[PDB]
Amino acid sequence: NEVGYDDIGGCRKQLAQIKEMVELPLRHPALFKAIGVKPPRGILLYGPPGTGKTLIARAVANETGAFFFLINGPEIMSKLAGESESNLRKAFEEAEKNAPAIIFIDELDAIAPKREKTHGEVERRIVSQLLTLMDGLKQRAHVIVMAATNRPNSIDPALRRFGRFDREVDIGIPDATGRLEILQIHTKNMKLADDV
Amino acid sequence: NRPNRLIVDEAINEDNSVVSLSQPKMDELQLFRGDTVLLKGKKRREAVCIVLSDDTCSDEKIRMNRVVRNNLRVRLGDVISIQPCPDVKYGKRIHVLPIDDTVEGITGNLFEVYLKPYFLEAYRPIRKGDIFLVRGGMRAVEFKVVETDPSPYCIVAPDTVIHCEGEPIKREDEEESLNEVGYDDIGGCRKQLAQIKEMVELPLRHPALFKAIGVKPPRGILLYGPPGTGKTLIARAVANETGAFFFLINGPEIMSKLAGESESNLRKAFEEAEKNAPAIIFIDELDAIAPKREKTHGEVERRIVSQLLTLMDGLKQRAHVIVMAATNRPNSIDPALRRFGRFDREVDIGIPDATGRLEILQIHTKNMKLADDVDLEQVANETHGHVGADLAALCSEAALQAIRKKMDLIDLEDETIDAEVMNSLAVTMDDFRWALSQSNPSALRETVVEVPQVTWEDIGGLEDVKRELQELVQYPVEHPDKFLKFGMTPSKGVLFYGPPGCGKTLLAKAIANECQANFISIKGPELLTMWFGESEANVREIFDKARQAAPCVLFFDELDSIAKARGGAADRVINQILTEMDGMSTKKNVFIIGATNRPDIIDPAILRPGRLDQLIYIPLPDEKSRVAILKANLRKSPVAKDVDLEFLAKMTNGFSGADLTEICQRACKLAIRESIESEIRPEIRRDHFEEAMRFARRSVSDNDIRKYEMFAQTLQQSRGFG
Amino acid sequence: NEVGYDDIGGCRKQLAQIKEMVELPLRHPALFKAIGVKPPRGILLYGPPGTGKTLIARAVANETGAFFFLINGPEIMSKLAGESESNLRKAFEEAEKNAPAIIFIDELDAIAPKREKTHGEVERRIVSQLLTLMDGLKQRAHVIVMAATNRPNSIDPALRRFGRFDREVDIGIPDATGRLEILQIHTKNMKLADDVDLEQVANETHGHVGADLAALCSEAALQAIRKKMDLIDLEDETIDAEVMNSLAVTMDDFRWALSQSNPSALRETVVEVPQVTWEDIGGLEDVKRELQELVQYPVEHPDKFLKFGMTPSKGVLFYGPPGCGKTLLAKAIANECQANFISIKGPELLTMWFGESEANVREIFDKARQAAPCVLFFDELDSIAKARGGNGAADRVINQILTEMDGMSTKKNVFIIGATNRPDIIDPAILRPGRLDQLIYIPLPDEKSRVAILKANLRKSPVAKDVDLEFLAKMTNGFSGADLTEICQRACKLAIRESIESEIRPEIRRDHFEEAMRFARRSVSDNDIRKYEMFAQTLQQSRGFG
Ligand SMILES: Nc1ncnc2c1ncn2[C@@H]1O[C@H](COP(=O)(O)OP(=O)(O)OP(O)(O)=S)[C@@H](O)[C@H]1O
Ligand SMILES: Nc1ncnc2c1ncn2[C@@H]1O[C@H](COP(=O)(O)OP(=O)(O)OP(O)(O)=S)[C@@H](O)[C@H]1O
Ligand SMILES: Nc1ncnc2c1ncn2[C@@H]1O[C@H](COP(=O)(O)OP(=O)(O)OP(O)(O)=S)[C@@H](O)[C@H]1O
Ligand SMILES: Nc1ncnc2c1ncn2[C@@H]1O[C@H](COP(=O)(O)OP(=O)(O)OP(O)(O)=S)[C@@H](O)[C@H]1O
Ligand SMILES: Nc1ncnc2c1ncn2[C@@H]1O[C@H](COP(=O)(O)OP(=O)(O)OP(O)(O)=S)[C@@H](O)[C@H]1O
Ligand SMILES: [Cl-]
Ligand SMILES: [Cl-]
Ligand SMILES: [Mg+2]
Ligand SMILES: [Mg+2]
Ligand SMILES: [Mg+2]
Ligand SMILES: [Mg+2]
Ligand SMILES: [Mg+2]
């Protein structure tokens, strides 16, 4: 019942790209340590709501078998100034401990929205906290930070720089074929009539 | 001074065992390009290399790669004593060993992979205690010479028996690493990296001399440019190359800590930097700490900016510290930092040009075994909007492609892959095209500043205009002597005007190429695109970009589109361009060219003396010129011998150069039809040209011409009553 | 080596004012107590960055020997809450104790920027603290509070009230003479080569301030050093005095320094005496005298106008065909009077933000009012007239210039000159009596003038003997002064091409002029002339229906 690539439809190409970027670095972690080449750090997934971004993230985690630490945007930003930055540190720390791992920051725009829009010292501090943590992965542990947002142009441009969320995947609305594909996945447990 | 003393300079010959002396010096020491010399540096250490000739190398300096430079324990801008060494003779045995951290990851046959081809037929003149670097298998390993048999120095002839003792060795304390950043890891920033080297080298390398002179050195050096241009790289490079202490202040890292902790870290940074003088404080991502004071609400944030300013003004200590800073946006920085005594010096590290990109590609393909079909010059050439980091990612991705496919079976289950495979693994030109497909360029939207690749040979006819253009731009740059002796100051700007598609845009680029001067092209619609409020501060940014890139030609193309938009925003832009033209001092070698397909609506203000007062009229091409255009367009195409380009020019005595180019394409588009449909020997012959000519295209009517000729004689009179 | 009045150039008149304000209260504190008269409390120094504001303050301190407490703006605002206001207190307290004293608040705009601009409370509170401390000087214990800013506007107006910062000094950018001065101050310790012409430096160094020139001298020196460095020693921790004397700074080194020259302040509205003279203008002799009677007389002979019962006219309007010396005349008359001169071009007025376009015109008229006697020159008015109808913002600006015109009292030595190549669209409001009512028509040059122009432009150029400028003038009838300069430029360009191609030594000779005349053009059509001739008479009636 757990999520897998078979639970995803309409994102064939995108799911492939994410498979390339992600697949080698985790079961080839000692290999990358041997090669010396730089793999991706942050893979940003954007598209309108209910497109399957949170789905794809959880799928890649279970299909590759990597450790999975979910960072829900709103959940962080609901807590006090201490807890917010603290939980960000704990997540990156525990993710590095259980490498290979995928840190999924869902609804990233909630944590690090356009700095022009941001007000208050605490919020700007949390963004800076995340930027440092992303830069912290340049230690080149076996860790990948996936992230999702409904609005790419809402994200603080600081996150889109090199070494941070440097790769992006446009997971858009499905076309006619994609919708047929998705319908099949959700009717695979139902007994359909012939006229359907 | 005896000839035996020279100063260390950068290396043109990227080889390890080599130095370069100028020919005048070469023959002076009576030692020849073939012989082996002994280098004696500081710390009472030595090294052996093959000396060679450089035309560029000034006689008093000696070019040596960073490896030799490291073994001598010397930096760029230090003196060493060279002397001939005929004492050296062929080698019997050699005992090298890899350094531990340069091999952490791999294991296997280092001899066959690294040492064997490195010394293959190379007759390298080594030395005991030397540390050399071998690149292969997508990494660079460092070995140190522990022992030789004709010790301590000997040559590695093909008969020389190369021994490997057993186990990798630890790193010595005083021995720097070669994986560390240096000027050799930076490309595309020749001119900019030169400036910074001049600013920083004197106060840091010889601080005592600057204390004695009394003259004021540079306090703050602000680096700007788009993301991934290598600002952090250049800063970290100058640190290791000058050998100064390096305290990194990371913007976000400071601002990620609590209120007082940020200001406390700022102090400790300047404190420890001052303590360990000479030093370089590098404030990376400065705009995170010191954005415009208006742009920031809150109290703490404003307090942190003020803290930085006080620390910056605290260089009254002058204890030999240089504060470098990097931002991706100058106008974000609080202007209070630009004041004298703070960040008073600036360096525009822009996006690399075609040559610069080729450089960078060569830097990130250093450790890879490229296939022969790989043409990096083509990669660079078809890479318009990439930055240093993009190219570094491009090479890295192309490598990951070669890896994952020739992975095939490999083993994977085995925790590590040996050096035999990685060396045999090659990166095809195909892999680069695949990596280029997934290319996400960082700086496409950025206005470009480079030397145009267009030449006179691409422009058919207009031989008169070409020559007048040479007088206006090239002479005042290449012969200031005459103009000062004649008592005249040159004209600043030109205006191209005439029918559409007759080579106005080409001429603008073509002259910039003739002078090998920088070139900037702002098209009318680009100006009308700008956000209204920022529009003004961005026009100012253009003229600054052109002022710094001098000698440069600032080209305002497609001015007619702005003239239409006026008769609101279009008004403010031009009136500011007029204002910026006046501010442009004639002595700055910034020459402003304007162009428009419509002289009937130019703001006469642009035509005022002192501004664009050189009104050059570019008409439709006469028969002779049309043939030159047709040949210029079919230059790179396989045309049949049967085609009569002359006759083609006879018939079309009303066609613009834009038409003739379209006609040549149309005929080509038909030839491609044949090549795909029938697989015929691919060649564009006559019957394509004739059919393409049958339908024809006259992009400039007769009435249009009459008007243009009327303006060719009356345009200067547009400043009075129209 | 400490700072003194001898270390300051270009600020002659300003430095004299500060001296007058400060000398009596500081050098004679006992005397001023006995009088009961009130001395100046606060002196505000404004001007762009690097003009020598901090310098002058530190200079006045040492020269008067007064106690000196430096209040660094950024330093205060970098400290914590109360520690800021607490230090402001101590600064005044300690200054009052050791009277006579000078408190210098450098970068005042950091402490007390626009009380509306600031966000928060601790900031507004620090401003309040300052206003109290300034008002707290009612102890009067001979303390003078100097202050420096680049933003004369951004300072909360509360500070510029009476009893606080009641006196202000515009230490603006230096002019040609001022830059020469500063260059001599910083080349004071260098051994200059004979080919070094610091006058040439000062003149082609338009937009530099004191800090720029100081760096420019430093630049030329460090380059001359790096040269003869060559061998030197370096390994030796110090260089001896013998070498340093043999070191010379060539004019070439200054030219290399001028190559890397980034001028700090450009487009900063310049206020200086123009170097243009009547000799630079061919012809117009009648208009030249007319300009004197309007400008020279009322400033040099006020007794006459007062006794005659008439008040002089305020402004002039130059109108006529393009390129006939309207800009030159404006600069010329100002130079003759040796009065300051401000040239605002039409486009410069259309550049500003909509909001700034009003508050910045006031700045102009204020800058002219203070630099009196001054010639305020509004050049290229035609470019504005076009931006109103299309022949929004231009409307607001002109109405502002009109309001500013009327408001300026005639008893001030400010003289306004407007100019335009097009009187067919000039705002009639500008032409109403009391404004630019002196309508001067400047036509194309007559034959006599054309010769004068030709000689004026070829003055510093190597023209051959056989060249006949009088014949050349006879041929160029309907040509303007701008055209004749272009023909000269065209002819000179040909002579240069010959010089490079053949190395015949520089002689712009006959056939060069002949070919330049072959391609020569008339920039003012006949029809255009007839119109200008009509407006030479009927422009008076443009305020009616017309
Ligand atoms: N491509 C897909 N194939 C099958 N089901 C999908 C797909 N995309 C979304 N869904 C369904 O949508 C639900 C989950 O969508 P989510 O991934 O959580 O939405 P989202 O992309 O994260 O958008 P937001 O920003 O969280 S509202 C599940 O019921 C999925 O089955
Ligand atoms: N000019 C360059 N020449 C060669 N390689 C470069 C260059 N610039 C960047 N790179 C490569 O890309 C990487 C990025 O360098 P950075 O110094 O981080 O760029 P950056 O300008 O500092 O990015 P910012 O300012 O943090 S957004 C380097 O480590 C190199 O691998
Ligand atoms: N003299 C010429 N020689 C070679 N190609 C020319 C020539 N003139 C025009 N062209 C072609 O016309 C195209 C446009 O060149 P331009 O310099 O931009 O002409 P233009 O005066 O700017 O007219 P437009 O408005 O750009 S079409 C180029 O791509 C050329 O291929
Ligand atoms: N009028 C001047 N005469 C001689 N030297 C000057 C002059 N103005 C500036 N300088 C030089 O440039 C430096 C500028 O120093 P400052 O006194 O700090 O100028 P400033 O106007 O206070 O700078 P700002 O406004 O705070 S950016 C001085 O140290 C001088 O060396
Ligand atoms: N009477 C003159 N004597 C000498 N040169 C003149 C004369 N009139 C015009 N010129 C030339 O024309 C140039 C401009 O002079 P201006 O005073 O600006 O004329 P104008 O009436 O303002 O016309 P424009 O539109 O500015 S060219 C000068 O630099 C001279 O080169
Ligand atoms: Cl226009
Ligand atoms: Cl008007
Ligand atoms: Mg979701
Ligand atoms: Mg960086
Ligand atoms: Mg074009
Ligand atoms: Mg100052
Ligand atoms: Mg003029």
Swiss-Prot record, chain C:
Stated role: Necessary for the fragmentation of Golgi stacks during mitosis and for their reassembly after mitosis. Involved in the formation of the transitional endoplasmic reticulum (tER). The transfer of membranes from the endoplasmic reticulum to the Golgi apparatus occurs via 50-70 nm transition vesicles which derive from part-rough, part-smooth transitional elements of the endoplasmic reticulum (tER). Vesicle budding from the tER is an ATP-dependent process.
Residue window of the full protein shown: 199 to 769 of 806
Keywords: Acetylation, Amyotrophic lateral sclerosis, ATP-binding, Autophagy, Charcot-Marie-Tooth disease, Cytoplasm, Disease variant, DNA damage, DNA repair, Endoplasmic reticulum, Hydrolase, Isopeptide bond, Lipid-binding, Methylation, Neurodegeneration, Neuropathy, Nucleotide-binding, Nucleus, Phosphoprotein, Transport, Ubl conjugation, Ubl conjugation pathway
Amino-acid positions noted as binding ATP 1 in the UniProt annotation, renumbered to this chain: 49-55, 150, 186
Highest classification ranks of the organism: Eukaryota, Metazoa, Chordata, Craniata, Vertebrata
Residues that bear Phosphoserine: 264, 499
Main location group: cytoplasm
Record PTM Phosphothreonine, positions in chain: 238
Effect recorded for residue 171 to T: In IBMPFD1; uncertain significance
Modification after translation, per record: Phosphorylated by tyrosine kinases in response to T-cell antigen receptor activation. Phosphorylated in mitotic cells.
Outcome of substituting residue 326 to A: Impairs catalytic activity of RNF19A toward SOD1 mutant. Does not inhibit interaction with RHBDD1
Consequence recorded when altering residue 34 to E: In IBMPFD1; increased ATPase activity; no defect in ubiquitin-dependent protein degradation by the proteasome; impaired autophagic function; defect in maturation of ubiquitin-containing autophagosomes; decreased interaction with CAV1 and UBXN6
Full protein name: Transitional endoplasmic reticulum ATPase
GO-annotated cellular components: ATPase complex; azurophil granule lumen; ciliary basal body; cytoplasm; cytoplasmic stress granule; cytosol; Derlin-1 retrotranslocation complex; endoplasmic reticulum
Domain remark text: The PIM (PUB-interaction motif) motif mediates interaction with the PUB domain of RNF31.
Subunit structure: Homohexamer. Forms a ring-shaped particle of 12.5 nm diameter, that displays 6-fold radial symmetry. Part of a ternary complex containing STX5A, NSFL1C and VCP. NSFL1C forms a homotrimer that binds to one end of a VCP homohexamer. The complex binds to membranes enriched in phosphatidylethanolamine-containing lipids and promotes Golgi membrane fusion. Binds to a heterodimer of NPLOC4 and UFD1, binding to this heterodimer inhibits Golgi-membrane fusion. Interaction with VCIP135 leads to dissociation of the complex via ATP hydrolysis by VCP.
Consequence of substituting residue 120 to A: Does not affect methylation by VCPKMT
